[PDB]
Amino acid sequence: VQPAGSVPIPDGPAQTWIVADLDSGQVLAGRDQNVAHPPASTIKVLLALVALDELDLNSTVVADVADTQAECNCVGVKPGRSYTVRQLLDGLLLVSGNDAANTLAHMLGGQDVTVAKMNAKAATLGATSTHATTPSGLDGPGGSGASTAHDLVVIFRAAMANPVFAQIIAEPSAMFPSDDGEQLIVNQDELLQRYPGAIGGKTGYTNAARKTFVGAAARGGRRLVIAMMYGLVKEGGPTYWDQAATLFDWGFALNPQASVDSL
């Protein structure tokens, strides 16, 4: 659970969580880090990994009508318009665009083959408790899907190893093509502004998943990665931003030579 002799970790709304070293892969602490829950939009990180593995950032696609129809939220993809893989990754990661997700899946061969590719990729990473049902993290034909706090940081750790991902996820904003003729899209990960040394994160929410989060931070040459699942913020209670900051602060204060397990 945590190293013998370390100080208490303050509780927060997230029901499962884990704190790991992003570079060493060592686990510092966890609560039910292997219990499965729906991932919501944290799974968009797994989608981004498949896109980065298979698609050139300069490659383009002309969106279909089906690409542009999706449940909240959307970046604003429009039918008949052209988009680069980089632009779709911006929409996917900065504002959690489900149309961007749809459109990337189009490029990877459709919804079904994209989900299959995502599940194959998770297996190769050792994320063996993860089952995506949609590219977006929305509910789909197979239901809400599944992952675990452990599997989420494994997936995020692999994404952070790609410097393209590390850059996009930490981007404050980007310019996205619109029908007049560019719109500023702003990174929704508030940890970037709330917690110094934060280097990126992905939030998620559905009714089935409740709130989810996976992200990383750096302090003095040390880098940590955390994931948090299945939480609801109560009025006057700690937020996901509070708990993320507390987990990072606990982890950086921990003896740098201490760990409880390996990813």
Author numbering: 29 to 291
Share the article's original sentences.
Several rounds of directed evolution to improve solubility yielded an optimized gene sequence carrying six point mutations. The resulting A113V, T197I, N208D, G289D quadruple-mutant protein was named Rv2911opt. In both structures, the inhibitors were covalently linked to the serine of the first motif (STIK in Rv2911, SVIK in Rv3330). In the Rv2911opt-PMSF structure the conformation of the inhibitor was not unique, and the electron density for the phenyl group of the ligand suggested at least two alternate conformations. Neither conformation appeared stabilized by additional enzyme-inhibitor interactions. Cys100 of Rv2911opt was found in a disulfide with Cys102 from a symmetry-related molecule.
A search of the Mtb genome for Peptidase_S11 Pfam family proteins (PF00768) yielded two hits: Rv2911 and Rv3330. The structures showed similar overall folds containing two subdomains.
